[PDB]
């Protein structure tokens, strides 16, 4: 039916979690980084980070903990995946050969149980007695770390609280004691329990429940001799240890929320904190010794050290070097200095690590007109927002990324070849008096304009100012900046000729956004012409809703205003005029076209295929997918195959069943392909990053669709012939036997389609990573794979395959990316 081939051009780059320990031996200090499905292992040396290994896992790493139980010479690594595959791994080395063995593996998924709002939480006792997992509301799963038993019996303890914010294991307890923050109708409180493995229960905790700040959201376990725990909220920081209780409310931290923390000293005298604005604080615990030699807390003191990237995770490595793992921007290796620099900051950056995520929008442009596609992406958010230009080539061929920082959030991008410029929607945050928080690109433009439309909050609130930026294509300098009306958000952006008008216009769909209203009730379709270095509002149309997406459709304007898909004609007086409407939608978020066909991707109703009838001047619903899915991107592979990425990290392909006999059966699209990508796809676009020379006609694939995801991943989807699909599916089945997985997760289980409503094995898709991994296994193993396999050598008949045949076949497959 559908024969697709999915491969990765750029591996995920967004850092999800960072840990440090003694993993490779008892003497190396290892930094372990989880980039979605990847686990990177570096050794801290005199030269910095020495990349030692990289492990691909068959799941999304949610938890990463290093623990060294008694009787172990070095650390074991616990990894839980998003499909609940749990694996305890040991790093083993035999000189030149590195073996990452799986000490234990299992699946800890529970069929019944509501996923918690705050997500998967995995903690390990300081004495390495147990692993605790918060996966569902009112349940705590305990995995005891025994040695003699053949099986690790993980059991559940009923957790009385139902809304847990954060859990931790306390230090200095003769029994494993947990401390957690929970929310109830009475507010937020902090509680402690003790884990009894024999009774399989929770006994009363060491110290009492306490009412805490309304925004208390982080729990830190302070090691001995201090003990206790620090509860961190939005406006105050508290310390609780039995009857001992301290609390401070520093005015410096009130601006934004602290999201990550790390322990600097082994005894917990100093902690690192990072907040959403990108600032780095040092929490200090001042100790006082009693006459009997005991050590007790005296006061808490917070200092501001400077600004870093927006930190998803922090990890103090050594000698004042801190790894700032960023999700919205480039990760960093930064150094804390004793004395501040000229700018009054103790923090000085040393190294930066590229992060393409979140890829919010992207376009394929032949900038140099050499016939090769370059990818221009709107990456990052807040002060990290930028444009990334991605080329394929030699500095072997790799991907080369150039960064153009904007210091504000880019939303949409479109390319206007006649003007030799890009149009970028962007937004920035201002404090209501409104004043800009920091200088950005929308404020350093050479020339700027403000909306003059007359067609249409408390102190301290944050308001978004949206701008349309005209950006040069050579220097990537912000030529022009157009600030829209107050409380107006620019959502969609297209660049097209309209009607018989020879002028190329930028077209922006906007909306009026107020916090109390659930949905926009007004919007504008504004047609600008960028000429003479100046942007002028050629036309503007008031519409009754947010213009979510617009695409040029055979010289007309196809727009989506709330649940309406409207067609506009560009008249002779150069104003828009409605031609036809299609109202049957919940929310027409995504629009694609091919010929006279429109693929509408809805918020929750999957895809729908309409056709414009030229001789009637109206739409007609050709067919629609009746399986509900939460789309995030749509694409039309060909006239009968429609691709779609949904919310739970899955890809599917629907087919216009032309073989149906009744018009009723032709109204349904059949889900001919299912696949679990493991990424949230933001953008699909037709194109390729490689040279499409005349000699490339020998490729067995047809089509090429790039997709950009939140985690900085870039992937490629192509189509195979039936015989090629069969051959590569046989390859898949045999490689699933030859290659053993880290953590021992079955590839078929990993790639299986899995949503809130259904779970089916992947069909009509060929994992390109697994197929390309065939080229690097040992030659005896290749003989094992190729053995007894039947191959069509090209003479029209089938023979016994040889290694060179399938080597050249796969070599041809890897020439598509």
């Amino acid at each position: 039916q559908s024969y697709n081939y999915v491969v990765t051009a750029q591996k995920p780059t967004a850092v999800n979690g960072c840990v440090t320990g003694h993993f490779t031996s008892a003497e190396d200090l290892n930094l372990l980084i989880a980039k979605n499905t990847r686990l990177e292992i570096y050794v801290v040396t005199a030269e910095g980070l020495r990349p030692v290994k990289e492990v691909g896992m068959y799941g999304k790493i949610a938890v990463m903990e290093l623990f060294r139980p008694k009787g172990e010479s070095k650390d074991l690594l616990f990894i839980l995946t998003a499909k609940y595959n749990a694996c305890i791994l040991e790093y083993k080395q035999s000189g030149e050969s590195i073996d990452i063995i799986t000490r234990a593996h299992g699946n800890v998924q529970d069929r019944i149980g509501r996923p918690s709002e705050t997500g998967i939480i995995g903690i390990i006792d300081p004495e390495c007695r147990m692993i605790g997992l918060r996966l569902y509301d009112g349940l705590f799963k305990v995995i005891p770390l025994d040695r003699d038993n053949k099986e690790l019996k993980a059991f559940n303890i009923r957790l009385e609280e139902l809304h847990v914010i954060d859990v931790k294991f306390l230090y200095g307890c003769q029994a494993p004691t947990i401390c957690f923050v929970y929310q109830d109708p009475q507010g937020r409180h902090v509680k402690t329990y003790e884990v009894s493995l024999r009774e399989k229960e929770f006994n009363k905790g060491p110290w009492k429940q306490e009412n805490v700040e309304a925004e208390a959201s982080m729990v830190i376990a302070v090691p001995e001799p201090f003990g206790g725990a620090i509860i961190i909220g939005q406006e105050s920081i508290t310390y609780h240890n039995g009857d001992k209780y301290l609390a401070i409310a520093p005015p410096i931290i009130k601006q934004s929320t602290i999201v990550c923390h790390n322990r600097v000293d082994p005894n917990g005298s100093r902690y690192l904190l990072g907040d959403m604005e990108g600032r780095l604080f040092m929490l200090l615990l001042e100790k006082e010794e009693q006459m009997d030699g005991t050590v007790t807390l005296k006061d808490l003191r917070v200092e501001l050290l400077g600004e870093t990237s927006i930190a998803e995770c922090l990890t103090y490595l050594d000698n004042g070097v801190v790894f700032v793992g960023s999700r919205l921007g480039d990760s960093q290796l930064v150094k804390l200095n004793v004395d501040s620099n000229e700018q009054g900051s103790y923090v000085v950056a040393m190294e930066t690590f590229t992060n393409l995520g979140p890829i919010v929008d992207m376009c394929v442009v032949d900038l140099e007109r050499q016939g090769q596609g370059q990818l221009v992406t709107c990456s990052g958010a807040f002060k990290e927002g930028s444009l990334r230009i991605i080329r394929n080539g030699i500095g072997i061929q790799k991907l080369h990324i150039r960064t153009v920082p904007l210091y504000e959030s880019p939303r949409k991008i479109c390319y206007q070849e006649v003007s030799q410029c890009f149009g970028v929607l962007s937004s920035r945050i201002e404090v209501q008096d409104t004043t800009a928080l920091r200088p950005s690109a929308s404020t350093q433009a050479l020339s700027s304009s403000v909306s003059s439309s007359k067609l249409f909050t408390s102190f301290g609130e944050e308001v978004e100012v949206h701008n349309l930026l005209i950006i040069d294509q050579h220097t990537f300098e912000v030529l022009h900046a157009h600030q829209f009306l107050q409380n107006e958000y620019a959502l969609s952006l297209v660049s097209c000729k309209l009607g018989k008008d020879p002028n190329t216009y930028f077209i922006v769909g906007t909306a009026m956004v107020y916090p109390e209203e659930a949905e926009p009730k007004q919007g504008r379709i504004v047609v600008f012409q960028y000429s003479d270095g100046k942007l002028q509002t050629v036309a503007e149309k008031e519409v009754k809703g947010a213009v979510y997406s617009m695409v040029e459709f055979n010289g007309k304007l196809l727009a989506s205003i709330n649940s309406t898909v409207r067609l506009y004609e560009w008249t002779t007086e150069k104003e828009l005029r409605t031609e036809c409407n299609h109202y049957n939608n919940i929310m027409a978020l995504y629009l694609k076209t091919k010929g006279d066909f429109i693929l509408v991707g809805d918020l929750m109703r999957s895809v729908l295929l309409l056709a414009y009838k030229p001789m009637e001047g109206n739409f007609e619903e050709i067919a629609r997918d009746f399986n509900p899915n939460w789309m995030s991107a749509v694409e039309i592979l060909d006239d009968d195959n429609f691709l779609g990425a949904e919310n739970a990290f899955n890809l599917f392909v629907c087919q216009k069943d032309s073989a149906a006999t009744t018009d009723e059966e032709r109204q349904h699209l059949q889900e001919v392909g299912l696949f679990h990508l493991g990424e949230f796809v933001n953008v699909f676009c037709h194109g390729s990053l490689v040279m499409q020379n005349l000699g490339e006609t020998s490729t067995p694939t047809q089509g090429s669709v790039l997709f950009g995801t939140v985690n900085g991943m870039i992937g490629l989807v192509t189509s195979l012939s039936e015989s090629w699909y069969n051959l590569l599916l046989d390859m898949q089945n045999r490689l699933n036997k030859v290659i053993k997985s880290v953590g021992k997760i079955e590839h078929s289980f990993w790639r299986s389609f899995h949503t809130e409503r259904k779970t089916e094995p992947a069909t009509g898709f060929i994992d390109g990573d697994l197929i390309e991994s065939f080229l690097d296994i040992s030659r005896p193993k290749m003989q094992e794979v190729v053995a007894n396999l039947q191959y069509d050598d090209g003479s029209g008949m089938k023979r016994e395959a040889t290694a060179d045949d399938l080597i050249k076949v796969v070599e041809e497959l890897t020439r598509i990316h």
Binding site: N16, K60, A62, A82, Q109, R111, I112, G113, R114, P115, E117, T118, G119, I120, D137, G138, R158, L162, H163, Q183, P185, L328, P358, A381, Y489, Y514, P515, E516, E517, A518, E519, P520, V543, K544, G545, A546, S563, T564, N581, H582, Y583, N584, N585, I586, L589, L603, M604, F626, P628, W630, S632, N647, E664, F680, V710, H754, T755, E756, R757, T759
Partner: protein
């Protein structure tokens, strides 16, 4: 004040997928933006008794006027009638004298539901039970039944996609409470039938292809529930018993007023409910799993099969609403406010602008029907999302 506007949530979703395991709530919160904000009154309705949607929501079940044939419709979606309502800005479509209003009320039902199959299953003078309907985990088939006096009872399994009757069992002398799935229970392709007159519990597993295979046959029994494939929960009269049919051992007994029984129910009401067994990712709402649900329960068995819809608008984690009417006729419309800010979001009203009332929500879509029933007269209204553009 927090940003409730859907555009904020869309942009936030684009730039971030949240922590691991949270991507389900990132879309569950969208039901606070898109809701059934419009109501059409007194829609023309075919001669059939509507029952409910399938767990996946694709199909709709009705019982014909002959009470011997089952009607299977395909649900076209909650946007199926958007074009008919243009220009009618407002919250309700008042029952008026204008020809457009009566035209809309005459076209709406056929817009929303399309007849697929009419399968005559009843025979020998038996009649289908109005309230008996169970669905398989794959949602490929539906379980129906047909019939203090005693009569011959019959159970059938019907493929929904194709309409073909798959399998049927008969019981010459049987007394089962087929109404509201009282004498029937389904859990993970395990079907249990409860014969009160014969003091019997009978077990089968159902095949994915839709056939019955016998498993086993086992103060007085009153009702039944199945905790899992290894444990029954029986009533006696009251006394509750949890028992194992594999080991034939009584596990536990309880008195109806016992306190440890009450606390265990408070602890595992979710496990007793089995709201959304038809999928691996579940979102139950009960006193056992929600702050507000436990608050209402504390401020104030056995559970019927599939009795709880998984509608997100009925989820207390998202919407504040009065608990009296929806989990006689409601004297007032039911209002739904947001949990985050408390602002009013949408009203639902079953009455024309005592009588029995019934409310049906789509398991996920912003669509609902309301039925008012009397001794001989019915009236149905449609609540659905609507915008004017």
């Amino acid at each position: 004040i927090q940003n409730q506007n859907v555009i904020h949530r869309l942009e936030r979703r684009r730039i971030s997928s949240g922590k691991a395991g949270t991507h389900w709530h990132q879309v569950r919160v969208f039901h606070q933006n898109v809701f059934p904000n419009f109501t059409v009154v007194n829609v023309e309705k075919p001669p059939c008794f509507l029952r409910k949607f399938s767990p996946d929501g694709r199909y709709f079940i009705a019982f014909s006027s002959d009470q011997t044939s089952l009607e299977i419709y395909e649900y076209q979606g909650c946007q199926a009638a958007e074009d008919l309502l243009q220009g009618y800005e407002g919250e309700i479509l008042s029952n008026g004298n204008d020809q457009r209003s009566v035209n809309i009320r005459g076209r709406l039902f056929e817009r929303f539901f399309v007849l697929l199959h009419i399968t005559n299953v009843a025979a020998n003078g038996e009649h289908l039970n109005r309230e008996c309907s169970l669905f398989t985990d794959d949602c490929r088939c539906v379980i129906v039944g047909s019939a203090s006096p005693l009569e011959d009872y019959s159970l059938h399994i019907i493929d929904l996609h194709t309409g073909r009757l798959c399998d049927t069992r008969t019981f010459k002398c049987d007394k089962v409470v087929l109404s509201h799935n009282q004498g029937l229970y389904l859990y993970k392709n395990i079907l249990a039938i409860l014969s009160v007159q014969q003091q019997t519990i009978h077990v089968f597993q159902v095949t994915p292809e839709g056939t019955f295979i016998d498993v086993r046959t086992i103060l007085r029994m009153w009702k039944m529930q199945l905790l899992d494939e290894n444990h029954l929960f029986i009533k006696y009269t009251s006394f509750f018993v949890v028992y194992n049919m594999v080991t034939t051992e009584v596990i536990a007994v309880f008195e109806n007023t016992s306190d440890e029984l009450l606390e265990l129910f408070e602890n595992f009401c979710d496990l007793f409910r089995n709201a959304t067994l038809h999928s691996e990712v579940q979102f139950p709402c009960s006193a056992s799993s929600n702050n507000f649900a436990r608050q209402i329960q504390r401020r104030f068995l056995p559970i019927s099969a599939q009795s709880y819809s998984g509608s997100p608008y009925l989820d207390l984690s998202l919407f504040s609403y009065d608990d009296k009417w929806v989990s006689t006729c409601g004297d007032h419309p039911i209002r739904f406010y947001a949990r985050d800010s408390g602002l009013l979001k949408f009203e639902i009203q079953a009455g024309l602008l005592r009588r029995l009332v019934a409310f049906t929500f789509h398991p996920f879509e912003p669509f609902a029907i309301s039925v008012q029933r009397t001794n001989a007269e019915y009236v149905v209204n449609f609540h659905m999302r609507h915008c004017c553009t």
